[PDB]
Amino acid sequence: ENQRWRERIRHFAEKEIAPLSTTMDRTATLDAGLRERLFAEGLMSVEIPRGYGGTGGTLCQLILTIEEVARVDPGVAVGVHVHNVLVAGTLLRHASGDQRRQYLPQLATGKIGAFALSEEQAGSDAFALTTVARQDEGGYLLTGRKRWTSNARNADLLLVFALADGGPTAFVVPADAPGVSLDDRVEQMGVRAAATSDVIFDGTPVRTAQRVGPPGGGQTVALSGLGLGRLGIAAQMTGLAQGALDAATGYSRVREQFGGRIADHQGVAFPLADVASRLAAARALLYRAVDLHGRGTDPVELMRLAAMAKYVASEVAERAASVAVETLGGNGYTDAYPVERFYRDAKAGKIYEGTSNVLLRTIASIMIGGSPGDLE
Template sequence: MTTPLGDSAPDEFATAVSAFARTRVAPRSTAMDRAAAYDPALLDELREAGLLGIEVPERYGGLGGGLRHVLAAIEELAVVDPAVAVLVDVQNALVAAALLRHGSGDQQRRWLPRLAGGAVAAFALSEDGAGSDAFAMTTTASPTPGGHRIDGAKAWITNAAEASLFLVCARAESGLTLFLVPADAPGLRVGERVDTTGVRASSTCPVVLEAVRVPEHDVLGGLGRGAEVVVSVLDIGKLGIAAQQVGLARGALDLAVRHAQDRKQFGRPVGAFQGVRFALARAAVEIDAARALLSAATAAVESGADAATRMRSCAGAKLFAAEVAERTATLAVDVHGGLGCTADSAVARLHRDAKVGSIYEGTTNIQLRTVAATLLAVPEAGGRDEEGLVGT
């Protein structure tokens, strides 16, 4: 997969990533889930396979793929391990995507080769008091000679423990602004990992910034344009999580079908009983529908659709894929019966992993709020649309 993608179809790339996931990721998944950490050797293999720079141009050491290649990789990795998929998602569909679409030429030349070369990135947006209401953040950026001083604390930051680069959102005098901050910047400190229920190998940590100095050339997208850039980036981020959830659902369904064919009760495979086979059939149809929504939303982003269409499509794809993943993972546990409730079973892990899909990158209610805002001309009762960004 280190060969540049060029004109390679996303389906061809998906086949290659699927083989990588089965042979390099799946054998490690149980141990990484137990340890609540990635195998360091796997991070090297992700880099060698080009999966940390999928959309990064060839001249910067990446694969030179497109958005659909990114989403194909996330989906195929999630079939076997959603925790690995989310690392690749944040790397490619958030930070690299932001640099490619909003970074200056200098920023791209400095950072894209590092990302493609194995430097892990993290997006520092959320805070303890600013989750669904992301723009209620209190992290500040104050002007200093030649740049800015950032002070504040971020929470629930994915990839924080492995990150070499943080894309930090803070309040400047001119409005929300994004900053490129190296992990070794004086004053930046990554806290202890949060012990999560699912996607346990993925690091989730608080990040403290105390008088962190950022030069002017590391402002991404321009001073005061952070809100606009964040919305644009989060649309792609939602597609990444939708792809992860579709992959998770596919993996859960595959395990359920296999067990339904092998497990016998009352003298026949449990898959012969209508109560099981119809449930599996419905799950297959829902997964197909989720993939279709994801494809349509991807097309809206690729074609430069208007903001309302793009936001509605991305929110809808993420919302539906997360719901399908949770239902399918629950079904897989049910089909496995008691075996599905053992801590180290693959279906139990996918069931734990599925829940966060309806929470991160915007909760289900936030996605519904976004879709509703594109349908109704009247404002939400008692709500507010800070900076014109409903549903972010």
């Protein structure tokens, strides 16, 4: 069943995504035809139940979706990850019956979800927010600025975190609500198909019915998806590494210098074998961490395994992309091949859903006792 699912996403990514990747990366756009296909074929609703217009599939199927998309286009995979894992997944866990019936069919059919937590001064210290939802009759008036919102220029629904007068609180806010605007602000090095924007709120009206969970319950809402967010990026990094390794292996069989294929030199072959070995271990850890979901496994152990999976997969993605650029020589430094894009894309995996240091802080803290804040 999961072999058939893998093959279906692989075929989709190779036929529908690959021919558009170079242009989506240069222009930082999501192709309109591809967007219609992502929704139609179920890549935007993998775990959303059938009763809300979703695929009704498993965490395993969602992880395989992100992996096989990422194998061809890590940038498209960011949008798929944010939408399914962070936005639809948060509503499946925390939204009321009414909120699920209102938003899940939209996310399953045609409305893209983006996740707006970070700010200029709230990065690793993610809840040092200055965006405020001020009380009003019937709900709130939202004012502030979010930074690094992936897929913002393509999004219809924002899951936004703001101080309720009261502590961090989660809201669902339409991207076209009064007082909402975007500032693309900067060029980013990779995952450009889902490039970030700043999101600006200028007294945007939000009804009480848009609040997800209680006032000051924003950190609990975010924390429930932390582990799953890290597995989704571990899957994106595993797929990226596979795509890099597939390009380098195939090239090494056909490029000839000095009268024979470059694969016949141990200086070319050995780095590929080393990457392949590390990638088999990264994938085994990812699928182990996924398998231990829905088993009543200790939550701390799940947090540990998700942080370790993302840390290891990120490392292997960097190594794979690096080795792949070098295996291809000058061609590997160009857009004629995908490996320079994979190299630019891989670096985003060390920054979002927990920087390397934030992951190691968490992991060490579980192993030696104390909290992450005790480690200097």
